[PDB]
Structures are given as structure tokens and as C-alpha cells.
Symmetry: C5
Subunit: 272 residues, 5 copies
């Protein structure tokens, strides 16, 4: 079923904000790509995978937000007798372009925190494999459930509201498992981290947890607020969540990765 966005009309500002947010995020991510590409070398090689992952996540995110921007532009047009942007006939907006890209982002983001905790080899591979499984299942179960949002919002003639709940609850179980895997890594860092590194890893985990927590809220929004102001708020919190979870987290984790690099005597890391 089409997203709740398609069943509304928009004031100039409601539509215009959302197109600005989609455009802002594409730029943040492309700018982040340039920054992570330009600064990766400064990390020691045994942490440089984390640096590289951040560039990969930026590409993924930039295309995710760019496609949403395009589809948002395509899917509505102004009507001057209504003074509203209104759905165009041949096109329907999907908030689910974003889910599929999360299949890249989510396991990568969790993986780079584990890389900086200092896991290597089989132990990195094992943790990567659990997080990827846990991640893909969270995301796929959520993607199914968001196909039922016109139903949960009570748009006449759409049925299957229960499906929204079931798929969300299953999804959230997979979320908890990922948080348990990562909580176990940051509590058990490898390579004799300092107590400062020890602390910065814990902060990275709670930052991860706080920012990832917004996404389940944005999921449930059609239930609370299925209106054009709700759509505006939902796209605002997705934007806060994307920039934090991906770019701000990447900069924070880069700072820990540099401290570890320098503590093990990487000279590029020390000169800065």
C-alpha cells in the first residue's frame, strides 16, 4: 500500500520543508563522503577499516536521500486553485526507498564500532555475521510492516492494521539483539584500550542507541499523527536521525579511532 504521505495535500511550507530536508541530507552525505575520503589515511591501518566504512556509508546514504528527493519532487505538483501540493496522477511516493539502503548502513555502522573496539579476524567476522543477520531481519521485517501504514492510519478502504504491529514488534526484537551484540563488544574492547578509550567506546554505543531509537518512532508516526504536519515532523526526525546516526557518529568514532591509533604510536595520528 502507498505511504501515508500520498493521502495528504500540503501547504506550500509543508511540501517545501520536506523537499529542503531531502536536499539538505543528500548534501550532508556527499560532503561527509569527501571528508571521510580526505581523512582516512590519518587512522592507523589496524583501524582504517572503520574509516573506510564511513565513506561507504556516506555513499549509500547520499543515494538513499537523493532518490527520496527525486521521488518527492515527482510525486506531487502545485495546484493554484487549492494552493496545495497534491499527488500527481501517474506517480506515488514511497517512504520505503530508505529501508533498502539501511541494509547497507545498519550492519556497516555497527561493524565499524566493533572494528574500533579492536576485534580482528575471526572475532570480527563472527560479530559482523551476527550483526548482519540481526540487521537484515530487523530491516526486512520493518519494511513489510511499513506497507500497511495507510491501514493503521485509517485511510478508508485499507485493511491490515494488525500487520503494522506484528511486523514492527518482530522488527524490534531484532533491534534488541543487535544492541546486545554491540553492548558486549564495547564492554569487552580489545588491545588494552586506555580508560579514556574505554569511556569513548561506551559513549559511542549510547550515541548509537539513542540515534537508532528515533527510527522506530518515525515508523509509528502514521499511528499517532497521520496528517501533513505529521509527515513534516516524521521527515524532520528522520533527518535528525540520519545525520546523527551516520555522519555525526562517524566523526565521533573517527576520534576514538585516532586516539587508539596514536596510543599505538601511529605517527600520522600523533602529528594531529
Amino acid at each position: 500500500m502507498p505511504s501515508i504521505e500520498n493521502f495528504l495535500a500540503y501547504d506550500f511550507w509543508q511540501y517545501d520543508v520536506i523537499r529542503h530536508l531531502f536536499a539538505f541530507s543528500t548534501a550532508v552525505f556527499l560532503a561527509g563522503l569527501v571528508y571521510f575520503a580526505m581523512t582516512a589515511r590519518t587512522t592507523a591501518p589496524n583501524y582504517r577499516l572503520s574509516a573506510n566504512i564511513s565513506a561507504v556509508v556516506m555513499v549509500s546514504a547520499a543515494l538513499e536521500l537523493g532518490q527520496l528527493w527525486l521521488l518527492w519532487n515527482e510525486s506531487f505538483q502545485w495546484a493554484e486553485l487549492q494552493g496545495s501540493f497534491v499527488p500527481v496522477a501517474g506517480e506515488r511516493f514511497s517512504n520505503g526507498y530508505r529501508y533498502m539502503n539501511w541494509l547497507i548502513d545498519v550492519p556497516m555502522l555497527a561493524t565499524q564500532l566493533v572494528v574500533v573496539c579492536g576485534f580482528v579476524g575471526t572475532e570480527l567476522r563472527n560479530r559482523w555475521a551476527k550483526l548482519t543477520i540481526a540487521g537484515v531481519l530487523m530491516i526486512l521485517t520493518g519494511y513489510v510492516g511499513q506497507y500497511f501504514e495507510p491501514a493503521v492510519a485509517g485511510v478508508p478502504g485499507y485493511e491490515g492494521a494488525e500487520q503494522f504491529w506484528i511486523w514492527g514488534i518482530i522488527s524490534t526484537a531484532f533491534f534488541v539483539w543487535m544492541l546486545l551484540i554491540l553492548a558486549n563488544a564495547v564492554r569487552n574492547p580489545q588491545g588494552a584500550p586506555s580508560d579514556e578509550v574505554r569511556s569513548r567506546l561506551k559513549f559511542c554505543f549510547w550515541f548509537l542507541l539513542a540515534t537508532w531509537s528515533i527510527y522506530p518512532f518515525a515508523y509509528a508516526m502514521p499511528l499517532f499523527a497521520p496528517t501533513a504536519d505529521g509527515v513534516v515532523v516524521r521527515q524532520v526526525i528522520y533527518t535528525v536521525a540520519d545525520v546523527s546516526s551516520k555522519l555525526v557518529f562517524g566523526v565521533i568514532l573517527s576520534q576514538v579511532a585516532l586516539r587508539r591509533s596514536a596510543e599505538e604510536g601511529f605517527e600520522p595520528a600523533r602529528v594531529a
Copy 2:
């Protein structure tokens, strides 16, 4: 409410100038991106964050101006019985694509001046955090106010002119606070700068202040001149302001960052 631009028609030249300006700026910024990417290494590592920020700002700005270019092309079409470019039916131009990207640019630009003053660590982080707060509030308050510009221009049937003023005045308070934070950094540079560096930092601040000051003028233009010639002038001063605030400032600040690099004996900085 749609921007004042949408309530006018344009002579060939009025429209054509504006599309040229949008296109010119996109090119300046992409060219600036190449230049900052090609010259960053020449800066010492303890100032290279400034170099990197300039590349980030260039990406941000290039996409900001590119989207405006696209929307400007989309939003109007020629009419030969009027010999004017006139608003197309399904699309409305927004001068507010630019505001959202300022959320990247403004705190970054101020941050790179602080990096070159020589702040590091917690002291950099603290200043970055104040400038980001001050910056986002200036920009968000201004963004609200520019949604009221058809009202302030007296386009029949648009109300809320007072909202233009209130949101502008609040915005300007946040501007003053940012200028106070930066004034305190350039007056208190770190790392035993030379008296030449000391002077060049002060010039960077006043350049920043002069160029940033144009933006509040472009804001108030619908009040002074809500006409197609006014729209032309407004887009000319935004263009002067963007190129100065972002690219020319970046080159100037790079020159200070190099002088500091060389004074601390960075050899790449000395060989040039």
C-alpha cells in the same frame, strides 16, 4: 507562503541573469572543491582540518546552488505573447532551498576560523558547539521568517507581515552571538602566532563579518523592492555573498593556515 519571486513576471534579461547567476555559482563551488581537494596536503596537519572544512563547504554550496538553478528553470516558462518568463502551473520556486544548506556552511565556516586561530581539543569542541547552536538558531529562525515574504511585500491576500519582522529580529540576535564567539577567538589566538598571523586572523574576522552581513539585507529585500528588478538585485547580492563568504574566505583563510604551518616548520608549507 511561496517566495516573492513567484508573484512576478520577468523580461528575458531578468530571468536570464538569474539563471546565469545560479549556474555561475554552482561552477565556482565545484571548481573550488577541486582546488581545496588539490591543495589540502600543503597545510600542516594541525591546521589541516581547516583545509578539509573548505572542501566540505564547497560540496554543500555547489548542491545548494545547483538545486536552485534546477528549480528556477522548472518554475517558469517563456510566454511569447507576454514576452516574459512566467510562473509554470505545477511548480513554485522557493528561495529557501538555500537556508537549509546554510546549516552546514555557517557553523563550518566559523569553525575553520577557530581551527586556524589554534584552538584544539575541548576548547575547539566547546567553541564548535556554541557556534553550531548559535548558527542553527539564527538560520532556523530566519527560515521561518522568509515563509512570510509575500505578506511583507503586500501581495494581496497574504497576511502575517509581522512574522517577517519577529523572526528576522530573533535571527539577528543569534547572529550577534556568533560574532561575539568568533571575535573572542581571533582576539585570543593560540600557539604564539606572529604579529602578522595575529593581523591576518583579525582581517579574516572582519571579512567574515562584512560578507555575512549581506545575507540579512537579501532577507529584507521583499520589503524594499518586491519587483523583478528587486529579485534580480537580491540574487546578485546573494551571489556576491556566497562566493565571498565561502570561496574567497576559504582562500584567505588557507593563506593564514599556510603561514602558521610554515612558522611551525611544516616543510611542504615552506617550499611554497
Copy 3:
């Protein structure tokens, strides 16, 4: 004859999944391009051709999936009285954009496995030449056969179902020959590989074989399931197959190439 996709209508979700998959894959490949570009140097020079090939394959794949994404968007439009995406009049979707790009990917992927087995010079060239011949013939014979899929699916008025079979069976003969060439290389690796390298090469071959095997299934799908749910499943298995055969295989083969690099004392490979 146009692909079976053109003879169906789609529910919102059927269409929307497929456009998400095409978009997801383009992003995976562009992100993979960044990753392979950023990590190639870490491989020793005598294996760096493999690293370079992975970047080449990523470009090829990203454009292949991007074209499909574009054509998928162009080829159908929503109809609200049918609540379906339906074929647009002037455009027809082709699943065969993907075949032509395989002419790059398939011989390159097989070549980089041979490079890492340690063949060099004439022996690399000979094997490259056999695999390229075998590969192009497999792909060209398959491309002919997929022009007959409306016929094999029993779309009224389309004839030549037998042509689907003949061209598929011929294609599969060329597949077997490529698998025989590669099986001979991984069983006869060069340069005194360790027993761990020896094992990792064999795993690379079976991974290659498993993932390449999905493609002949996706070929035969119009025969089993010529429905919109079948089209959905087919595009899901192509997506699993593309990401595995190209990106995941590239990361796995990079790990072997690094182990070999380090065993021969490449210092960048050892520091990580």
C-alpha cells in the same frame, strides 16, 4: 520480444520493491567502488591487478543497475482506477540491459580469481583469453534466448518458445567450460601458496560457482512463474546474485590477495 515484465500489472508493493532493489544495487556498487578504490594499495603489486579489477567491475555493475532503475521508472506508471502500476505507452522495459554489462563483469571476475591463484604473463593471458571467449559466448547465447521469454511464458501471439531452450542449453555448455577453466586454476595455484591460501582459493571457486548458478535460474523464471510475484522473486534473486557475485566475492578475494601479499612480505599487507 519485450520482457515478461511488460505483460503484467503491479500492486503498489510489487512495483515498489523492484524499484527499491534496483536502487539498492546501484548504491551497493557505487559504495563498493569507493571501497575498492580506497583499499587497492594495501595489496602487493603482483596481486594488485585483482584489486583494480574489482573497482572496474563495480563501475560496470553500478551503471548496469542504474540503467535498469531508470528504465523501470520510465516504463510503468500508476493508475488509480486499477490501483496498479501499468506499462506506459511509449516505453518497454528490457531485462536485457543487464546481459550486455555481464560481458565486462563475467570475464573480469573470473580473471581476478586467476590473478590471485598466482598466474602471470602468458599463462595469465592464455587463461584470460579462454575465459573471455567462454564468457562472451555464454552471455551472447543467453541474450538471444531471453528475447523469447514472452513466448515461453505463453503470452498470446508470441511464438518461438523452443528458442528459449536451445539458446539456454547452449549458454549452459559455455558456463560449464568456464567452470572447468577456473577449477583447473584454483587446483593448481602458483607461487607456493600456504595450505590456508590453498583452501581460501577453493572456497572462492565454490562461492563463484554457487552465486553464478542463480543467474540460470533467474533466466528460467518466466517458465516457472510468469506473474508479477514471479517478476518480484526474479528481481530479488538477481539482486542477491549481483551483490554476492560481484561485491561479496570481491571482498573475499581481497582477503586472499592480502594473505598472499603478506606471506610474500608486503609490509602494507602485514601492518593490516
Copy 4:
């Protein structure tokens, strides 16, 4: 007023040549960007600014020609009952997209010749500032004058032919001043150039002068030849002029910059 191009119809070949020229130039400049990016390091650091400028100019030029290509495609369509490309209703072509980008190119091109003459510091800055002033005024005065070209061509109902002349003549005064600034730099090179360097700098100046001289001709063309064959010739000479002034000049000036690099003992410059 719209450019003279808009008042004509085109044979297949007239239109097709022009779209080919616009496309050819975009490619030359993008290819030039790759070349200047790949070869900049070979120059000594004290001349590397020249190398960098060439990359900047290439980006600028590629976007200038790309936008003209796009607008040329947008602005006309084929009509089979006339067998002509003819102006589309909603769009008008502007030859003035190119002027605005010259604001980047012209002062940069002149600046890089001064860099290679060996000016540095204040003396470079002073000369850059004079050339930028002289350049912007030449270009802005010319841009005004080209808004009067339908008038000078005698398209019925367009007045202000005199404005074409006045703005052209003013523009040309600013041209002469730039040529005087540059003539003074190449006659007074810095850093004890060889007599070969001394000669190569003079050739660079006369090459600059010859190629820049074509642009004032292309300006005056509506006066001589306001026909579709004239439009073809004008776009041919702009293309010769762009490739020469920007790319060929950049390669020539790079050869001088390398000779100077090698004479001062830059080893990368000597090994090649």
C-alpha cells in the same frame, strides 16, 4: 533581449553541428580536468598554483559548455513539415550562459601566466587584483551589450542597436588594459629565467592574445551575419577559441612551468 539564435530556423545539419560542438567542448574540458589533475604534482611547488588553476578552469569551462548544450537541446525541436529545428514555445536560448563563467576563466587564465612568470606574494596579489578588476569589467560590459543583439541584427521590433556598440567598445578598453598588465609581466619575468623560458613566456602571451581576440569577433557576428549559417560559424569560432584559450594554453603553460621547475632542480620535473 533573446539571442539572435532564437530568431532563426535550422537545417538538420546547422542544428546538429552546433549540438555536436557543445558536446565536444564539454568532453574536451572534462578530459582536460582529468589530465591536469593527473599531472599537477610534476610541477615544482612554487609553480604548482598554475597547475591547479588549470584544473579549476577546466571545471568552470566544462559546466559552461554543458549548460549551453542542455539549453540548446531544450530550446529547439524538429518540425518535419518544415524539415527544420525550430524554437520551442516555452524556452529561449541564451548565448550568455558563457559570459558569466568567463568571470572565473579570464582572470584565472591571466593569473596563471603571471604565476609562471615568477611573481609571488604581494606582487602576485597586486597583479591578480588588477587583472580581476580589468577582467570582470570587460566581461560585465560585454554581457550587457550582448543583450542587444536582436536589435543590431535588425530583427523587427527590437531597438537599442547603439547599446551593442557602446558596451562592446567599453568592453574592449578593459581588454586592452588586461593585455597591458600581462605584457608587462612577461617582459619582466622573475627568478632569473633562462632565455628559453624568457621566449616561451612571450609566446604564451601572444598565444593568449591571439586566442582571446576571437571572442570580440564572435561578439560582433550578429552584425555581420545574422543567419543560421552565421550562428554556425559563430559557434565554431567560439569552440576553437575555448579549446585554445583554455586547454591548449594550459598545456603550453604547463610546459614552461615544467622547464622552470627543472631549472630550479625539481626532481620530478627532471625525471620527465
Copy 5:
């Protein structure tokens, strides 16, 4: 006159093959650009110009094939009552987008063979200048002649078939001269090449000659086969010719350039 392509209709497969070929070639060239950019450094500096030229040619070729792809998509649309792709009203396809880009490719390709033969300085410059003159004249004379192809094919109402012949024959004279210049360079290589290098240079020349020879055939095709199957064959042989002449030749010439690099003791060339 419009190309012969415009006077035909296409079966699904005829059209679909051609759009696949245009798309395949764009990808090969972009992938080739990445490969040549990633491997240039491995060549010794005195041969690195050849490496750089290959990247330049790849950019040129990628845009040439991309524009043809776009125009091919734009110029025809499906008609279900004819089951054919048929010319759209407002657009006409030109096979001559490709000619203009040859102005870059042809003299560059010939130049890089001369660079690897070991010519330098004035002797390189002289040969570059002859090949560029010879090349531009071959290409411009051919470009004129291909404007007469509807005439030579006997499309009713198109006259000037003789012009096809005259311009082709003139063009071919310029071809012979280029082949004579290059034949003289590969027979007289510089820098005491080995007998293996001596042989590999001769093979490069005959490869060049064979692949360049296809282009005059594709020219003459409207004479032999002015049908949709002919158009298919012509675009197949252009595709074989482009990939061979540009990418495969570049890889072959890179192998010679590396052998020469290593023989003169370039260590990066020896380690691989």
C-alpha cells in the same frame, strides 16, 4: 540530412540491442577511466604521458557514447499498434555525435603510440602536429560526407549521393597519411628498445590499423545495407571498434610502456 537510422522502424530487439550497445560502451569507458587512473603511476615518468592519454581518451569516449545513448532513447518511442520503435516527432537521431569526439580520440591514440616508441621533445611535437592535422582532416572530411547518407541509401527526395563518395575518398587519403606517419615511428623506435619491445610496437601498429579500418566500413554501411538490420550491424561494429581501438589498445600499449619502464630500471614497473 538526418542519419539513415531515422528513416526506419525497429523491432523490439533491433532497438533494444542498440540501446544496450550504447549503454555497454559508456560503461566500458567509465570503467576504463577508473583503471587507467588507478594504474598510471606504475609506468616510468618518461612514458607516463601515454598512461595519461589513455585516461583522457576514456573520458572522451564515455561522453561520446553516453550522448548517443541519450539521443537514441530520445529519438524513438514504442508504438504498440505497429509493435515497433518509431521516430518521435520533435527529435532526430544523429550518428555524427561520434565524429566530433574522434577529434580528441584519434590524434591522442596515435600520439600515445609515438610516446611509447620513445620520441620526445621536438620530435614528439612534430609527429603530434602531423598526426593532429592528418587526423582532423580525415575526421572533418568524413563528417561532411555522413550528412549525405539518406541520399546514398536512396531515401526518396534526398540528393547528393556523390557527396558521400567524394568526402569519404578524401577522408581515406588522410587516413593513409596518418598510417604512414605511425608506420614510420614504430619502425624507428627510440631509446634502444629490446627486440621484444621492437616487436610489441609493431603489433600495436597493426592492431591500430585493423581496428581503425572498421570505421570506414561502418561509414559505407548505408550503401550496402540501409535497413534496421543494417543499422543493428553497423552499431555492433562501431562497438567492437570503439572498445578495441580505445580500451583494448590502451591496455596493450600499457603493457609495452611497462616493459620499457622496467628495462630502464623503473622499480614500480619491475615489482610488477
